[PDB]
């Protein structure tokens, strides 16, 4: 369990709320041992010494006693609900935070490598970490810390009797989860494997429904998923096969606790040959002390998932970041002039104010250059300066301030339309907001709930062509003075690219724009043009350069 | 009843269980059995402690007593394991029959429906929601019939011996309904929909992460830690208020367990004494009959207070009913099986009279289409993304039900069965999904008893043998999980491969070649255009240049077939196709 070691550090931000949480289960445990003890000690005392002893009897010590472990349990368990829960959100959200913080500074290259269902097992690890406390935890040590305080407690009568009630719960507490555990390791193992493989034909058979029933395959391939239903149910039968095991034992290590009690106590108490009321006393505490075991068992086989949700966890935060920021002091420019070297070796040089468009087919070969550009992982070839210095000198508050990026997969936050837009601009007045929607031609999402639309999984999903103006939208917000076009006006049709590209050069006239395209609409207006296979410039120049050379983007003109 | 949400779901998984009504008998007859050994041990207890205590009798003397309490643990124990594997029955033939109905009804709907949300969605609903309703079942529900089983047969038990000690715990039975009655039940609707703010804030916490990226180049790393920080305690903080009410009914059980005992005590206590001298039926109070009250005072509670420990088992299976009632009752419009069938194998054709394609929520997809396509001649659809081009491939396909009048051979699509109509066609498709094992397998699709000659034959008609070698068992190499083993270019091949094994009436191509390679373009097109020469054929592309040999275009725009004509006119027209072809060959 040496995994858990990163993340029982984080309790130290609340330890006292944690720390309150698990004594107050404590307290009510101890409370419901006292009171039933304390019943049935009062029953047998009060029945030997009979109406003869009634004056002398004193009773009004008990009743306080009665008293206090009747509110001290009430109150305990009210508490003990209160305090866990709220210090089991308090988890969740420092989880949460640290995750998210560990998860970033890596955020590009780290989890690359199916990167959507990869986040799904994030999502679920941190809610299984959230488990460890009032799952396990608290369980756990609540059991420990009640048997002490009953082995303890209930020695200052009898040595031998408290040492054998609380060798029996001793040995239950640490022998038999982990008997368990071991036991089922077997089916536990079996249970994760026909869960997957049913997962991978259901979904494989709802992705390919059109090709199942076209094909005339959809019903025999229901079955063999229904098959796998089978053994999974029959895996799944055999977890409670166990688990019924477990609570038929912990029942009978219970009725050993109260045999043993009954018989040793018969015997004597201390040196008393005979033990009259002290006989209730120690079956009475045998009766009660077994309800703090009950969730023990249990709680030892979700430490199994919490452990290994947190190799997992730890597999990815604890990861090394492509790249390195320096904790310096920069002022952003104005004007920002970018030059390459040698980076399969290209060299460019773009001078600050001057468009560029760059002609790579796709496929043939991928514009990384953009992403290193952003400091996304370090260029290996060579160096990469920006304003006549190196990109690696700028810390990240100044470099994110100095280039503006419309990626190709536009990410749509489930959020209002405001806060998909105050991620550009952290603040920004709520007309000088809207301006900007009107000139990127977003004026219809202004129509209904302008602003405060819900946009992503509450509701509103957006169009492709709608979906890239709002990445130009947040361009335009996040003034900056080089702007990196990431295939604008791909997959859209000829009247929407057409009037983005017109929307680029006339909002984007003062800035360094390098774009990014394996198309050939509008590229009169750069200058400049790069066209490059495989990461090789073949030539460039302006688009008057190109036609008269008869280079490779003359023959793309005339559709060879 | 009620009209709360909580009490409309928790009234759905109820109908639910009849399924096993058998297993939840079963294990409802064996709380009554524990019931009674319950009592049976508490009897033999009290018996017990009365000679020792009172008798001075010593314990091997009592090894009569001892016996019969060993086997009332022992029955208890057997009577505990017999319950819990009754119990677990009762939920697995429940979830065994939701998830059939729900597979049943997602297989209905058909792929029209199946595409409308993420592959992951479905076996969420299908494996995660249908499992989380498991321990309502086979813990929530028996023991909620424990809860008053054993508390009623605990106090006709005590009864007899001592009425006093029988009313100080039937005193207390009807205040724990009179409290659920007055706040209880209010604040468990309001658990339920902070159990939807929880899974609210899940998705919240998912999207910062699907968006690092985003977040990444916009530098709102620190300002995102603060937004995750606020949305985590507006939850906790709302959530607290509602869990301050919710506690008390767990506080209440509590007091009023910790009352009975106090109370059974103090009355035994000085009935001893003599202070107290009601109660008995005049034949004396004995230690006997204080201890089984006192035994059997936490018994009483102890199947409330259990149900409390299964409250999330409960909680979790409403939310998942929360998505398994509305997914059953959601209105959907199956396109119309006949029970017509085609009479030759020859090629099909395709008239269609003001025809309109229909989604099953109801939208309509494709407008007033007429178009007709005599026996063998290949036809192309084109026009803008989104212009209702697959609704048409879909339609005839038998996927999407349509209003108007579509006619296969002079035979209306709606009154062909869908089983035999479906032998006759043959669609490679739009983002193509081998569905079987092994690469093998997915060829064979089209019919698995096939002769290993016309195996190879399409397979080298498909251009996929050229790349077997690649592989590294061949053709048995397994495709694994969305065939990341096959790249998307030669993934593309095995699926032609899939359609030209088998012959057909109609061929449908929809986007074939779109997003492959230079490469997997060129042997994907070279197999499609001499295999569209064999039948009926409706392809869909982008490939504006290449289709200057197919007998018809449709240029489809909003729905609707805007252009019609040969590519040798409509090139040069300088209409709607024109405007396309020119966009087209911008691309590089
Ligand atoms: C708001 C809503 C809610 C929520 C969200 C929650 C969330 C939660 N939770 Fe909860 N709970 C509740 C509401 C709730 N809850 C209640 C109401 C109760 C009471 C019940 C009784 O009576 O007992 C509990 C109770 C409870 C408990 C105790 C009992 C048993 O043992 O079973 C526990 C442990 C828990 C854990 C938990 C967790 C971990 C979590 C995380 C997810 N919890
Ligand atoms: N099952 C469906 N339910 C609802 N709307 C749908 C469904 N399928 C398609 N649509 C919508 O109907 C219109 C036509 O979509 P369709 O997929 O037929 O177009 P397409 O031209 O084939 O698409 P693409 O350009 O992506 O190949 C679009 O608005 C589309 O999103
Ligand atoms: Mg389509």
């Given at each position: 369990m040496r995994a858990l070691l990163p993340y029982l550090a984080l309790y130290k931000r609340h330890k006292w709320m944690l720390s309150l949480g698990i004594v107050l289960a404590i307290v009510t445990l101890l409370a419901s041992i006292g009171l039933l003890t304390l019943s049935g000690w009062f029953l047998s005392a009060s029945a030997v010494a009979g109406v003869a002893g009634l004056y002398s009897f004193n009773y009004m010590l008990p009743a306080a006693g009665v008293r206090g472990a009747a509110i001290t349990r009430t109150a305990g368990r009210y508490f003990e609900r209160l305090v866990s829960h709220d210090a089991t959100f308090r988890v969740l959200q420092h989880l949460r935070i640290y995750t998210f913080s560990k998860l970033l500074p890596l955020?590009?290259?780290?989890?690359?490598?199916?990167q959507g269902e990869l986040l799904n097992r994030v999502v679920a690890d941190v809610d299984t970490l959230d488990h460890?406390?009032?799952?396990?935890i608290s369980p756990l040590v609540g059991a420990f810390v009640v048997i002490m305080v009953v082995t303890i407690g209930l020695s200052f009568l009898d040595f031998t009797l408290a040492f054998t009630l609380g060798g029996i719960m001793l040995l239950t507490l640490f022998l038999m989860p982990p008997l368990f555990y071991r036991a089922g390791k077997s089916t536990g193992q079996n249970l994760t494997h026909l869960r997957g493989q049913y997962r991978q034909q259901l979904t494989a058979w709802l992705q390919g429904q059109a090709e199942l029933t076209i094909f005339g395959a959809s019903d025999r391939y229901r079955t063999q998923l229904e098959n796998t239903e089978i053994q999974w149910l029959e895996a799944q039968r055999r977890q409670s096969e166990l688990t019924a095991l477990s609570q038929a034992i912990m029942l009978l290590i219970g009725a050993l606790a109260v045999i043993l009690m009954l018989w040793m106590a018969s015997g004597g108490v201390?040196?008393?040959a005979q033990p009259g009321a002290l006989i209730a006393l120690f079956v009475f505490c045998a009766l009660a002390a077994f309800e703090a075991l009950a969730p023990v068992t249990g709680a030892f086989q979700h430490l199994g998932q919490v452990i290994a949700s947190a190799v997992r966890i730890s597999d990815l935060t604890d990861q090394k970041p492509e790249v390195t920021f320096p904790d310096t002091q920069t002022r952003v420019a104005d004007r920002v002039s970018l030059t390459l070297r040698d980076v399969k070796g290209i060299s460019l040089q773009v001078n600050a104010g001057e468009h560029i468009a760059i002609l790579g087919r796709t496929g043939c070969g991928k514009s990384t250059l953009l992403q290193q550009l952003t400091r996304a992982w370090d260029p290996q070839q060579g160096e990469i300066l920006l304003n006549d210095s190196?990109?690696?000198?700028?810390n990240e508050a100044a470099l994110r301030q100095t280039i503006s990026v419309v990626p190709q997969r536009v990410h749509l936050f489930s959020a209002t339309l405001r806060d998909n837009l105050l991620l550009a601009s952290p603040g920004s007045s709520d007309e000088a907001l809207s301006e900007i929607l009107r000139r990127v031609g977003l004026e219809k999402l202004l129509?209904?709930?302008?602003?405060?639309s819900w946009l992503g999984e509450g509701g509103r999903q957006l169009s492709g062509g709608e979906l890239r103006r709002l990445a130009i939208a947040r361009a335009l917000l996040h003034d900056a003075p080089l702007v990196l076009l990431d295939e604008?006006?791909?997959?859209?049709?000829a009247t929407t690219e057409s009037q983005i590209l017109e929307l680029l050069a006339e909002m984007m006239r003062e800035k360094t724009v390098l774009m990014v395209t394996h198309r050939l609409r509008?590229?009169?207006?750069?200058?400049?043009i790069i066209v490059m296979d495989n990461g090789q410039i073949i030539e460039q120049g302006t688009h008057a350069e190109l036609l008269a050379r008869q280079g490779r983007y003359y023959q793309f003109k005339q559709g060879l | 009843m009620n009209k709360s949400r909580q009490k409309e779901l928790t009234r759905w998984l109820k109908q639910q269980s009849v399924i096993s009504q058998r297993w939840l008998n079963i294990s409802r007859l064996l709380g009554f059995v524990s019931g009674i050994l319950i009592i049976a041990q508490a009897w033999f207890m009290a018996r017990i402690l009365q000679h020792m205590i009172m008798?001075?009798?010593?314990?091997?003397?009592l090894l009569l007593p001892f016996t019969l309490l060993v086997l009332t643990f022992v029955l208890r124990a057997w009577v505990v394991w017999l319950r819990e594997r009754v119990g677990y029955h009762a939920g697995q033939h429940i979830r065994f029959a939701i998830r059939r109905q729900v597979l049943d009804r997602l297989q209905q709907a058909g792929p029209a429906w199946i595409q409308g949300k993420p592959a992951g969605s479905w076996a969420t609903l299908v494996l995660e929601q249908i499992d989380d309703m498991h321990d309502y079942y086979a813990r929530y529900l028996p023991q909620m019939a424990l809860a008053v089983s054993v508390p009623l047969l605990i106090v006709v038990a005590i009864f007899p011996s001592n009425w006093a000690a029988a009313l100080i715990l039937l005193g207390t039975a009807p205040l724990i309904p009179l409290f659920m009655a007055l706040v209880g039940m209010g604040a468990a609707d309001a658990n339920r929909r902070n159990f939807l703010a929880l899974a609210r804030l899940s998705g919240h916490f998912l999207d910062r992460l699907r968006g690092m990226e985003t977040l990444r180049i916009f530098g709102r790393g620190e300002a995102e830690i603060e937004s995750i920080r606020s949305a985590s305690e507006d939850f906790r903080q709302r959530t607290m208020e509602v869990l301050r009410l919710a506690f008390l009914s767990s506080g209440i059980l509590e007091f009023f367990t910790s009352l009975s005992i106090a109370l059974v005590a103090v009355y035994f206590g000085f009935s001893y004494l003599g202070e107290l001298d009601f109660?008995?039926?005049?034949?004396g109070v004995t230690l006997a009959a204080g201890f089984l009250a006192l035994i059997l005072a936490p018994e009483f509670f102890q199947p409330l207070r259990d149900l409390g420990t299964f409250y999330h088992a409960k909680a979790q299976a409403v939310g998942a009913a929360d998505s398994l009632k509305t997914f059953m009752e959601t209105p959907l419009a199956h396109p119309q099986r006949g029970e017509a069938e085609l009479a030759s194998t020859d090629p099909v054709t395709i008239e269609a009279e003001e025809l309109f394609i229909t989604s099953?929520?109801?939208?309509?997809?494709?407008?007033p289409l007429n178009f007709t396509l005599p026996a063998g001649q290949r036809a192309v659809l084109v026009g803008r993304?989104?212009?209702?081009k697959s609704s048409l491939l879909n339609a005839l396909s038998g996927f999407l039900s349509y209003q108007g009048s579509l006619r296969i051979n002079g035979i209306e699509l709606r009154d062909l069965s869908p089983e035999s109509w479906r032998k006759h066609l043959s669609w490679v498709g739009?983002?193509?999904?081998?569905?079987?094992?092994?690469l093998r397998d997915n060829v064979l699709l089209?019919?698995?008893?096939?002769s290993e000659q016309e195996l190879q034959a399409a397979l080298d008609n498909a251009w996929?043998?050229?790349?077997?070698?690649?592989?590294?068992?061949?053709?048995?190499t397994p495709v694994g999980d969305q065939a990341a083993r096959l790249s998307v270019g030669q993934a593309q091949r095995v699926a032609v491969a899939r359609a030209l094994l088998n012959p057909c009436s109609l061929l449908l191509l929809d986007?074939?070649?779109?997003?492959?390679?230079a490469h997997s373009e060129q042997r994907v097109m070279e197999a499609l255009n001499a295999a569209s020469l064999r039948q009926t054929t409706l392809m869909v592309t982008?490939?504006?240049?290449?289709?200057?040999?197919?007998d018809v275009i449709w240029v489809m725009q909003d729905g609707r077939i805007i252009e019609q004509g040969r590519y040798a006119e409509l090139s040069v027209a300088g209409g709607p196709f024109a405007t396309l072809l020119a966009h087209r060959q911008e691309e590089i």
């Open positions: 955020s590009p290259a780290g989890l690359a490598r199916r460890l406390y009032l799952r396990v201390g040196g008393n190196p990109i690696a000198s700028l129509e209904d709930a302008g602003l405060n604008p006006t791909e997959g859209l049709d509008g590229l009169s207006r750069f200058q400049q | 008798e001075n009798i010593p314990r091997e003397a109660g008995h039926y005049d034949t099953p929520e109801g939208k309509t997809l494709a407008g993304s989104g212009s209702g739009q983002n193509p999904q081998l569905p079987a094992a092994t089209a019919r698995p008893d096939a996929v043998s050229e790349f077997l070698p690649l592989l590294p068992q061949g053709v048995d986007e074939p070649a779109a997003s492959l390679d982008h490939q504006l240049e290449d289709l200057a040999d197919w």
